[PDB]
C-alpha cells in the first residue's frame, strides 16, 4: 500500500495532509552507540530524521535487524524516518564508492523490514551519488531512472528520494535540467528530488533561482542537506516561503575537517553549538516551523 506520496509536486501523508520535512541527519552507521539521539532530536522539535546507513561497500553493513530497530526508534519518537545509503557518495571520483545499483541490491535485501512502513519511512536511494567526473555525471539521469525502476519492479511502494550529482550540489545543473525525465520514469509518481546546499549556494540569487525552478515546474524537492559557506539564513527563509522541506547536517560527530557542522557537542542533547541553536531556534528554524506528521496522532 502507499503511505507518504506525491501529488501536484508536493509531499502528502495518506490522509491527504501535506507534510513539510523539518529535520536533521544522524550518523547512525558510524555511532551505533548513540541511539538516544532519536529522542533528543525529537525533543528539539524535528519531525524527521535522516539516518546514515551503509550497504557494506565502504563502511559496515546495517543488517535487517539493525534497520528494523532504527524504524522502531523513529516510530517510538514520532519521527518520519528517511533512510539513506551513504556509500554511493562521490562515485566516479571517490575511490571505493558504491554504485546506485549496489545501493538498490541492499534495499531489496531489506524488503521484508521495509514493506508495510510506507507511512513512516522515506527511502533516499544513495547519498550524493556522483562526484564531478564528467563521464559519470552524464549518467545521472539514466542510472537514477534505472534504480527507481528496479525498486518499483521489486514491489517497493515508498516515496523515494533521489540525490543530485556533483557531490549533491548539482553545480552543472544536471539534476535541474533532467529531473522531468527522471520523474516520468517512476510509474507511481512518488519520487522526490533532493539538493544539498554547501559552498555553491553562498549567494541568495543562486538559492532562489534553483528552488523556484522546481516549484514553478511542479517537481518535488527537498533540501536534503545544508550547512552554515552556504547562506543558511536565505536557505531557511526560502524553504519557509516556498513551503519546501529541509534537513540540516548534522546532529553530532562530524570528522574530516567539518567539525563546525555538529549541532550538539559530543551527542549531548542539551549542549547545542551555535549551529544547533540557529537551525532549531533561530528564524525559520525547526522548533518554530515543524509540525509532527499526523500519522502519529
Q: What domain range is 138 assigned to? A: 1-297
Check if the beta carbon of residue 227 is closer than 8 Å to that of residue 198: yes
| Count of domains for the chain | 1
The CA distances from residue 295 to 39, 120, 186, in Å, are 18, 8, 25
The CA distances from residue 264 to 51, 236, 279, in Å, are 16, 19, 11
Strand locations in the chain (E) = 5-7, 10-12, 22-26, 48-53, 80-85, 121-124, 160-163, 191-197, 221-226, 245-248
Check if the beta carbon of residue 44 is closer than 8 Å to that of residue 287: yes
What residue has cell string 506528521? 293
DSSP code at position 36: T
For the residues of 112-142, what is the DSSP string, one character each?
Answer: HHHTT-TTTEEEE-SSS---S-HHHHTTHHH
Count of Cβ atoms closer than 10 Å to residue 36 Cβ: 12
Check if the beta carbon of residue 180 is closer than 8 Å to that of residue 217: yes
State the distance between the two ends of the chain, measured CA to CA, in whole angstroms: 20
Q: Is 157 a catalytic residue?
A: no
Check if the beta carbon of residue 140 is closer than 8 Å to that of residue 130: yes
The CA distances from residue 181 to 60, 280, 292, in Å, are 34, 35, 32
Give the list of residues 6+ apart from residue 124 with CB closer than 8 angstroms, or none. 50, 82, 83, 84, 85, 160, 161, 162, 163, 194, 224
- Which one is catalytic: 117, 118, 157, 225? 225
- Could you tell me which of 179, 285, 293 has the C-alpha nearest to residue 235? 285
Sign of CA pseudo-dihedral 55, 59, 63, 68: negative
Experimental method used, please? X-ray
- Which one is catalytic: 128, 157, 232, 238? 128
Tell me phi and psi for residue 74, to 5 degrees: -60, -50
Distance CA 245, CA 220 (A): 10
> What angle (nearest 5°) sits at the alpha carbon of residue 166, between those of residues 163 and 170?
65
* C-alpha count within 13 angstroms, C-beta hemisphere, residue 165: 27
Distance CA 34, CA 41 (A): 12
Q: What CATH number is associated with residue 131? A: 3.20.20.80
- Could you tell me which of 143, 147, 179 has the C-alpha nearest to residue 160? 147
Check if the beta carbon of residue 20 is closer than 8 Å to that of residue 253: no
Q: Is 225 a catalytic residue?
A: yes
Distance CA 274, CA 259 (A): 12
Check if the beta carbon of residue 283 is closer than 8 Å to that of residue 237: yes
Question: Which cell numbers in the block locate residue 119?
Answer: 507511512
Amino acid at each position: 500500500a502507499t503511505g507518504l506520496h506525491v501529488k501536484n509536486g508536493r509531499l502528502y501523508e495518506a490522509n491527504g495532509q501535506e507534510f513539510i520535512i523539518r529535520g536533521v541527519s544522524h550518523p547512525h552507521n558510524w555511532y551505533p552507540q548513540h541511539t538516544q539521539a532519536f529522542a533528543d532530536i525529537k525533543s528539539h522539535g524535528a519531525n524527521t530524521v535522516r539516518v546514515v546507513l551503509s550497504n557494506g561497500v565502504r563502511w559496515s553493513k546495517n543488517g535487517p535487524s539493525d534497520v528494523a530497530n532504527v524504524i522502531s526508534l523513529c516510530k517510538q519518537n514520532r519521527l518520519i524516518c528517511m533512510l539513506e545509503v551513504h556509500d554511493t557518495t562521490g562515485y566516479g571520483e571517490q575511490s571505493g564508492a558504491s554504485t546506485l545499483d549496489q545501493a538498490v541490491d541492499y534495499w531489496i535485501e531489506l524488503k521484508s523490514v521495509l514493506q508495510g512502513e510506507e507511512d513512516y519511512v522515506l527511502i533516499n536511494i544513495g547519498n550524493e551519488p556522483y562526484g564531478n567526473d564528467s563521464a559519470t555525471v552524464a549518467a545521472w539521469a539514466t542510472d537514477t531512472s534505472a534504480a527507481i525502476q528496479r525498486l518499483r519492479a521489486a514491489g517497493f511502494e515508498h516515496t523515494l528520494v533521489v540525490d543530485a550529482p556533483n557531490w549533491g550540489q548539482d553545480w552543472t545543473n544536471t539534476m535541474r535540467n533532467n529531473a522531468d525525465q527522471v520523474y516520468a520514469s517512476d510509474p507511481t509518481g512518488n519520487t522526490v528530488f533532493s539538493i544539498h546546499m554547501y559552498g555553491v549556494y553562498s549567494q541568495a540569487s543562486t538559492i532562489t533561482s534553483y528552488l523556484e525552478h522546481f516549484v514553478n515546474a511542479g517537481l518535488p524537492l527537498i533540501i536534503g542537506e545544508f550547512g552554515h559557506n552556504p547562506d543558511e539564513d536565505t536557505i531557511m527563509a526560502e524553504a519557509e516561503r516556498l513551503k519546501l522541506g529541509y534537513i540540516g547536517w548534522s546532529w553530532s560527530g562530524n570528522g574530516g575537517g567539518v567539525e563546525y557542522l555538529d549541532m550538539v557537542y559530543n551527542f549531548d542533547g542539551d549542549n547545542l553549538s551555535p549551529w544547533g541553536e540557529r537551525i532549531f531556534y533561530g528564524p525559520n528554524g525547526i522548533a518554530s516551523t515543524a509540525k509532527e506528521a499526523v500519522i502519529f496522532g
